[PDB]
Amino acid sequence: FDTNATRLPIWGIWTAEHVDQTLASGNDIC
Amino acid sequence: WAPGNYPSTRRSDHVDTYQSASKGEVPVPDPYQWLEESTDEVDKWTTAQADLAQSYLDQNADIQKLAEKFRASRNYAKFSAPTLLDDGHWYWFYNRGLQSQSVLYRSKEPALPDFSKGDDNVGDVFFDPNVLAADGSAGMVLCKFSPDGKFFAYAVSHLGGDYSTIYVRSTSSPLSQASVAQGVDGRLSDEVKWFKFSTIIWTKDSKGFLYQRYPASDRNAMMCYHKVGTTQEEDIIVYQDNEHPEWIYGADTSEDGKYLYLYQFKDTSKKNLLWVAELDEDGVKSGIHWRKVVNEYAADYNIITNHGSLVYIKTNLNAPQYKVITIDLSKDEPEIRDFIPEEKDAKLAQVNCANEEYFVAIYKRNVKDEIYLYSKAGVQLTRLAPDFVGAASIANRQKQTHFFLTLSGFNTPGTIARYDFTAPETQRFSILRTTKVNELDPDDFESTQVWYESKDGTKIPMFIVRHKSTKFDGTAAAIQYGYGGFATSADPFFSPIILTFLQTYGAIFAVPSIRGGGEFGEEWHKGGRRETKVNTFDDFIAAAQFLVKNKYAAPGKVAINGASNGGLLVMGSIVRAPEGTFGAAVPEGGVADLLKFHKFTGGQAWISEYGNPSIPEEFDYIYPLSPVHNVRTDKVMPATLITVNIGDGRVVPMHSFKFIATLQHNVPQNPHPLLIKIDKSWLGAGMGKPTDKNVKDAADKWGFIARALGLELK
């Protein structure tokens, strides 16, 4: 996680085709 | 559709006067200043524009055929790396294929699942974001289990609002359609509102968590602590600075429970303060004593871990490519030493501590990630996944005897690798799961890296992806992606929709590593930032010219796409490039008014990237670059489809409205269509749209490009 990167002019937490972030979504949940 | 039939758009006589260091006082007409507002006139205008856009897309029969292709390409099972909680069970996200939000699963047994059996066969639903609202409007933006594994904090975004709300539930209380139907929701009473630009940072006692909130534009951020089993009125303010209202905050807690770290950021640059507080066992209270270790904005500092008073920190202090330092806090004047020195030609992207004393490091060399395992003595022990080509991340908890790597790229959909320290030395590294796609074969696609030269002589790498039947013989169409800013690397990524488009039309996909990004560290960002921002555009334009010149793509068959800063990139690129450089342009939610970006929502932080329009010296390099203020009457523009979400709070849709209105005014008889597609669903802060809606939007975008470049379905 990057605090300052959550407020960039960027598509979603760098393109519209990044739609699915399921692969990395379990990397830091604890 | 024909040329010269755009909606009637009123031109006001609003004039803003700016100070220029060279020109003195400069009056800048802003006839579409009124498109900043939310009014009935603007509602009529957005309706008219959207109907015109949809009318043109209705003429293209191939869009419906692409939607079929793209839906099928997306329709495959997807999954995260699993996380072992302290209850002994493993938790991972799972998507059946086309679910708008993935579902958090929990292992049936307290053991690592054999995932070849199937996710439902080895686990049950723990947390389903899709049922947070009955209509599916509520989105889980992030979540965090407590260290002890007993609670699950989760931030929920609603449609309409610009803030998330954190709720807490016991991990023994699952959220599913079954649990909702059978009883009460099952969460605790806790309701922590006004959460934004933050994560959830549990204290190691599992009693509560740290979070950033705002008061009930966004200013006066507060770092706060919430205790589990209480209300938000009882939450402690951990830090605020009313003297610097524009500053924001982050936090971290050491695994041993000894330290509380505070980060402070003044803008979107990679520069932060770092204060350290010592926790005594009852945990976070009011009146925390801060030791001001880093107390000036100079470099990037992110904590990796600590052993006693020795703190390990990933930093770019006197090290543009990043490195690991140790700061010994037992010393009154702390001694700073290199633990893992800077590599001159590889950016240190991430470092996690694993199995208590080892370090897993990800280096980015020529925009390609390399994974290494380091010992406690800083010795590089081995390279992991040496033949992997793409982007990589680490998933672990420090105290545990394993870690995972999530691996992906242009033709790697999603590999999850496991390293197990308890196994025999030759058998530690293994593949846990490989993502299986639908219809596509990733082996049909080749990715290569080629170098081209910008206007100033700088050599820039660029990824080129194609279906392997496609020849570099000056006949293929090209789709050129870019972001170009904020030290954000344009990394490799798997897109089944892109690969499907490439196979369908025999086109190629291009990703130049332009300056402004962080592909080669701080100096690469500095090369396309503020006064040097023009280099980003020159790099991006040169890339497109190189593709045509060297026979990768046909003349006039290079389309360009980008989102947000990528929207600014594409909008500025069509204005600045020679006629016929591009065959199509698709800016998605882009910045465009660079004279007023800082006046709206969180735009003021982006002065780090673009400069300040109010400063005369900086106005002089912004004004000639601003897409809104540099459209001409004598240049034929390529077919343009601008896309925005009207509820976008990050980049106000203002930017795109002014640009399309200015385009339509200046070149009303342009032979190619200049359209804007406007989504009117107020999408909440940190959400995807629904899956079916994404597929439809993709089909529109890629179909528009296909038709603009004269591509047919074989």
Author numbering:
A (entry chain C): 2 to 14, 19 to 35
B (entry chain A): 6 to 221, 230 to 727
Passage from the reporting paper:
GmPOPB is the macrocyclase responsible for macrocyclization of amatoxins, eight amino-acid ribosomal peptides with the core sequence IWGIGC(N/D)P. Amatoxins are cyclic peptides further modified by a characteristic sulfoxide cross-link between tryptophan and a cysteine, and hydroxylation (the extent of which vary). GmPOPB is an unusual enzyme catalyzing, depending on substrate length, proteolysis, or macrocyclization using the same catalytic machinery. The protein contains two domains as observed in other POP enzymes. The domain containing the putative catalytic residues (Ser577, Asp661, His698) comprises residues 1–81 and 450–728, and the other domain is a seven bladed β-propeller, comprising residues 82–449.
